[PDB]
């Protein structure tokens, strides 16, 4: 339990770190948008966007949920998918029976 206990404690501390980061971040958003006293918006410059395009347990969380969400959602897709195939095929064979029956009616 200790390895999971210590890891839950570290990840809860990191979650709290991220909560404070988000709170102070949105506070900064609010204050710098208050500096944006106008409702208008500054065209985000390509050069400024370029230099943002030049400067930048966490991964285990990222691996774990990208993979687990890859797990059931896939099985749900094929299962819902294959469920559609089996009954639409049943329609198709009933469809072909009526067509085959009606085909001889046409000859009749």
């Amino acid at each position: 339990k200790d390895v999971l206990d210590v890891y839950i404690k570290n990840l809860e501390n990191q979650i709290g770190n991220k909560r404070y980061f988000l709170k102070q971040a949105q506070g900064a958003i609010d204050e710098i948008t208050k500096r944006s006293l106008d409702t208008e918006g500054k065209p985000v410059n390509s050069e400024v966007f370029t230099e943002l395009l030049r400067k930048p347990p966490i991964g285990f969380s990222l691996t774990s949920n990208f993979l687990s969400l890859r797990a059931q959602s896939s099985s749900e897709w094929l299962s819902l998918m294959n469920d559609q195939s089996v009954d639409q095929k049943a329609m198709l064979l009933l469809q072909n029976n009526i067509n085959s029956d009606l085909k001889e009616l046409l000859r009749k």
């Binding site: 390895v3 958003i29 106008d38 918006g41 985000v44 991964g59 687990s68 009606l102």
Partner: protein, 171 residues
């Protein structure tokens, strides 16, 4: 047992990545609005390039800790041992999806050719029915039919109750 805490993390990791992504989404345009005090109008394609970069950041970070755990597959972290199965399933499941995705197109093509056949049949039937003669006092005939019913049923009863040696369709 340890499974309780394992599942606590299985949900807290969803929380962690959700929040890390919104933290990136705040950080990038906080830096942009730091460059210009009111840079809030980043464009759709600009936003999409930012999204692409963040997706590449997912790539790099999950690669980073996959390297951390698998570069020395030492199995000391019990979580790594679970990540092994969690990785195995993700690539084991793929083939069935690929094959069914391929096969349904052929099945729907069968449906389409059946529908085209059927449309041809309906066109022919409509033409022939339009070319046909139209569809067309029976008081005596129905009375004759009532006489038929009475005769046939009355003997169907009496012959049975007379022990008749060859019961037959009286018509």
């Amino acid at each position: 047992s340890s499974e309780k805490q394992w599942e606590r993390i299985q949900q807290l990791e969803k929380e962690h990545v959700e929040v890390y992504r919104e933290l990136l989404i705040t950080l990038d345009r906080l830096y942009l609005i730091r460059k210009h005090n009111h840079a809030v109008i980043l464009s759709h394609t600009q936003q999409r390039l930012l999204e692409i970069r963040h997706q590449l950041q997912i790539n790099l970070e999950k690669t980073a800790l996959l390297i951390r755990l698998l570069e020395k597959p030492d199995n000391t972290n019990v979580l790594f041992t679970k990540l092994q199965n969690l990785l195995e399933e993700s690539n084991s499941l793929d083939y069935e999806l690929l094959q069914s995705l391929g096969a349904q197109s052929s099945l729907h093509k069968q449906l389409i050719e059946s529908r085209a056949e059927r449309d041809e049949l309906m066109s022919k039937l409509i033409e022939l029915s339009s070319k046909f003669p139209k569809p067309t006092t029976a008081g005596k005939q129905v009375e004759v039919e009532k006489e038929n019913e009475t005769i046939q049923e009355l003997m169907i009863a009496l012959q049975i109750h007379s022990g008749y040696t060859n019961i037959s369709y009286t018509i």
